[model samples]
Structures are given as C-alpha cells and as structure tokens.
Target: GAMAPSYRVKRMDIAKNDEECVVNAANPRGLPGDGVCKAVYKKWPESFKNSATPVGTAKTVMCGTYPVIHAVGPNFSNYTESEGDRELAAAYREVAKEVTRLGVNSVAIPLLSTGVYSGGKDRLTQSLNHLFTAMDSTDADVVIYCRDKEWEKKISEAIQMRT
Candidate 1:
C-alpha cells in the first residue's frame, strides 16, 4: 500500500499555523494550562471551558475566523500503557473525522499528548503510527507541526520508517 499524498510534517509554532483548521491536544476537561492548550487558550479564552469532551474523542470550537478541534488525549502519567495506546489512536482518528466533517482542505496538529502528558520516545513512535494511518482516512492535508528540532527529527525518522 502507498501512503497518502496529503500526509506531511511541518516544524513551526502552532500559533503561526495558517491551515484551515488546527487540532489541539486538550485535556479531558478541555482546560488550558500549558503547551499547545495554553497557546490556544491565550487567543480564545472563552473556548477554554471545562469541556465535556472525554478521552479518545474531540470536539470542534469555532474561534473567530478559524476553527479549532480539541482532542482529549489520554494522560500517560496515569493511564496504563495499553489504555494510552488505544486512546492515542482513537484521538488521532477523531481528529481526521473532524477534518472530514468540517470539510477542511488542510489541518495542522501537534503530536498529541507528548508534552506535559508525559509521552516518551515509544509514545512518539506510537503517535506517528496512528497519525499517518488516521490521515489516510481524510481528504485533508495533514501537517504534523512541531516546534522542537529534536521532535522534528524524530518525527522525520518515524515518517521515513513508515513510508
């Protein structure tokens, strides 16, 4: 099988992403505290409510001109490894579903749950595996946005192995 042409990776701040929509790795409460959630909250404070979104799913919020999808990724710090893996995969799938539902041409998304959520190298690989597979389900171009050079390289390496 061939990879989707829409699959890609981009190293940039989520704030600077100009895609049709962006996905944030939000908490189950959907509150903003640190990392990507904080960045999104700074611009749309009203959207940072204690949301009803459960882990392994996402919800959409129309923030002014652009839409933001908030996916409640599993907190690896608490969840078992099996649960974390399943939830992470589900979160990625929900993101692609949201992109399809919104009919967006492109979306920028960070590696879900890798920041303060305590995801490690193995989880990074797992996330990439889920992400690339999920991207194939949507027509939108998926950009795996990362700000860190180390992450970008690691992401690139994962992509190379998978593709």
Candidate 2:
C-alpha cells in the first residue's frame, strides 16, 4: 500500500532529527518526562516554567511552529500500566491537528507515552498504529521518531499495513 498524497509520514530516529515543530510528552503534574520532553527543557529550560499548559492538554512552547507538549493519559495505577492506546491516540490526534492549525508544512513526533508509562514494547506497536490512524488525512510531512531501527521498522509496517 502506498500513502495518499495528502498523507506524508516517515519513521526515523528522533535523537538527531530536528524540525520546525516537535511534539513532546508530559505528565498531568506539569513535569517533563522521557522521550521528547527531556530535550524540551534543554532547548528552552528558562521559559518552560513560565509556560502554561494544563495537564492532559496541549501547549506550544517556543523551542514553530514549536515543540508541542501534550499531556499523556491520566488515571494511572501500578497494578495496570502497560496499555497506552488511549494516550498515544490523543497525542497523535492532537499533533496532527496542531500542524494543520498552525499552518505548518512539517512536524516531528515521538511515540508518546510508550516508554515511561510502563507501556512496554507492545505499546510501541499500538502507538505506531494509532499515530498513523490519526494522521490518515492530515496534510503535512510528519516524521514519527523512534529510538531505534526496530521501532522504525514497526512504524513502517504499521503505516504500510494501514495504507
């Protein structure tokens, strides 16, 4: 299957890639976690404290176009923490919309909440699926960042399977 012209998605390691707009992950407590959030502070640590983005919400901090830090899923418990389809879905949905709303041509995003949420490798596949689904009709060059080639392959297969 081939991507529709309207949908431009790719999978790459995000550690070295930079774009005008990036999406990071955060918690409901206004604290940055792993993935893109760690880099967000390094890029704009001085202004981050002053930024106003409520939990489970999306906020644009100058880091686009900018780094969109959207709060991941709430309602966490140590007893059950591996499934993350909901939060990843929201993260992808929000970023795809943000790209359109900001009228930007390109953006990069991580597999939000896949790591710290105890979401595990299974959640990675789920996130890739959700990410592409949310971007089905979006009009932008979206690069879904992965930590390694294994995830890159997963994302690729997800996009291919969906398209």
Candidate 3:
C-alpha cells in the first residue's frame, strides 16, 4: 500500500464535487459512450472534435464549465478487468500537476478503474495503491467520488488502512 499524505479525502459523487476540477476516464478514441465520458460529452461535445488520445496517461481535455473535468487514461483497448496501474498513476499525477499548473487546489475523482473495469478485491486494492501514490504529498484537497455504497465502503476502508 502507498503512504497517503496528510491531505484529506472526501466522499461524494463527482457531479456534486465542488472542487476546481473533476476527472473523467477516456478511452483511446476519446469516445464519450463509456462511463463518465458520456456525461462529459453531453456537457462538452467540442472536446472530442479535436481530442487527443489518452494513449497512456497525463493527457486531458478540459470539459467546458467551472471545475473542469479532466479526461484521462485506460485506453479504449485497455479498460479491463484489471485496469492499467501505470495509466491510473499517471492520470492522478497529471491531475495533481494540473492542480498546481492551474492554481486549482481542489479536485474530485472517480476510482480510475471501476464499473466496466470492476474486478476482485486485489485489483481494487492495487488500484487504490496507485491512486494514493500519485495523489500524495500535495496541498490540493482531494476527493474520490463514489456512486455506489459498495464502492464507497471499499475506498473508505482502503484509505483507513493507509499508513
């Protein structure tokens, strides 16, 4: 498990996040049919017109609105039962990077791998490990949005288990 810094973690749905930016997981096509991307597309159709493929991670497009929505990894081919740790880590890193770059000190996030990317316990734990690692040691206020009670419990337990 990665060590979590003193930064606090909050719980809520991404849409409800009052932070400066929310996160969205985009496929290689930057398709909006997937999870949060659909909502993003609804809000910002222009994002895909000149979208950059999130081939690995740290790549993003700003959704039109306050508290920008960041589009990041797990390419179309890789959104799997076991999601990409490298991509997940990089995505969080970029979010933190964006935080500093844009002076947006608060962020809201999804699990980076869940829904279609859902898996067994170990996978979830590993995903959390990568997430915590990338999100660490920053001044930003970080919140992971959970849409399900189970997901809520899982993340809550995982962060509590952190050192």
Candidate 4:
C-alpha cells in the first residue's frame, strides 16, 4: 500500500540512511544484524560501534552519526505489561526529539516494543501512530521502515487510519 495523505510513507524491505537524520526503534542489544543496524554500520562503522550513547530512560546504547540517530526502548522488566506498552510510545517521542535536537531533518522508525520483547501488536501500533503524528507536525520527513511483511502491512494501515 501507498502512504497516507497527511504524511509521506515509503515502503522498503530494509532501512536506509539518508542525508537527513535516521531514527530506529531498536532492541537494547544493538547487535550487528537487521537493516537499520546494517545501514548505520555501512555508512559509519566507527560511529555505529563506538560513538552512540544511551538516552533518557532507555538503558540501551543510542548513537548519533550526524544525520542518523539510534533509539531503543526500556527493558521489559522495567514495568508491568500495560505500563511498559504505554512507555514504549513515550520513548519514541522522547527519542525523536533527541534526534531532532542533533539537527537532523528526518527520522526512520521501526515497530517499537515488538519482536523478542513480546510487545503486543495493538500496543505497538498505537505507539507508532502517536509517534508519527508528532513527527508530522514538524518539518522532519519521518520514514517508518518494516523488516517483515506483517509490519509493513500494519504500518500501512496505521498511516491510513491516522490520516
């Protein structure tokens, strides 16, 4: 599916680094796999492995590579199921703001609180919608990248519903 009217959403099989800033909703481990990490490593290997720092309540390391910023949500043990889900959305906004403050023009996000963390699809969708809406209000070009077909479909639907 195409993007919604209110925002520009492009579908891609993997995450890519842009001249504008890049934002990733990632795991705490920050391993060397996945499109987002691969993109970051490919562009700036040194920065990806060493320059990034953790931000806000998230315990994981986040890095800033000029136009690209990496963000990870808090650990699963930090809160109850419901509270953790809610915080996931807030983390997106907090991380995005931090990325913007670094003077980047755009942000790319993945499905927060999903995968091994066991975050629910509905909760993840809600969090993403909120984050995208906030991004739309700004001058930044926000890109939501999905690794799997299901996530791509969910994001496509969320963009449509929000708009």
Candidate number that wins on lDDT, 2 or 3:
3
Error of 4 at 121 (Å): 5.6
Order the candidates by TM-score, highest first: 1, 3, 2, 4
What lDDT does the true structure give each of the candidates?
A: 0.79, 0.58, 0.60, 0.54
Between prediction 3 and prediction 4, which has the larger lDDT?
3
- Candidate 2: 10-residue stretch with minimal lDDT: 1-10
- RMSD in Å for all candidates: 3.0, 4.2, 4.6, 5.1
Top model number, TM-score: 1
Question: Number of clashing pairs, model 1?
Answer: 0
Instruction: Please give each candidate's TM-score.
Output: 0.87, 0.73, 0.73, 0.66
State model 2's lDDT: 0.58
Model 4, span 1-163: residue lDDT tens: 1133234445563345343555554445555545455665565454455434442233222344344355665445556766675666666766656655655455555555555444333455666765765565466556766666676777778767855
lDDT of 1 by residue, 68-144 (tens): 88988888888998988899999998987888888888888888878788655446777777888888767776778
- Runs of candidate 1 with Cα error greater than 4 angstroms are 1-5, 119-122, 160-163
Lowest lDDT 10-mer window, candidate 1?
1-10
Better of 2 and 4 by lDDT: 2
Candidate 4 colliding pairs: 21-67, 52-63, 53-62
Model 3 scores what on Cα lDDT? 0.60
- lDDT per residue as tens, model 2, 75-99: 3343244333455566567666766
Order of candidates by lDDT, top first? 1, 3, 2, 4
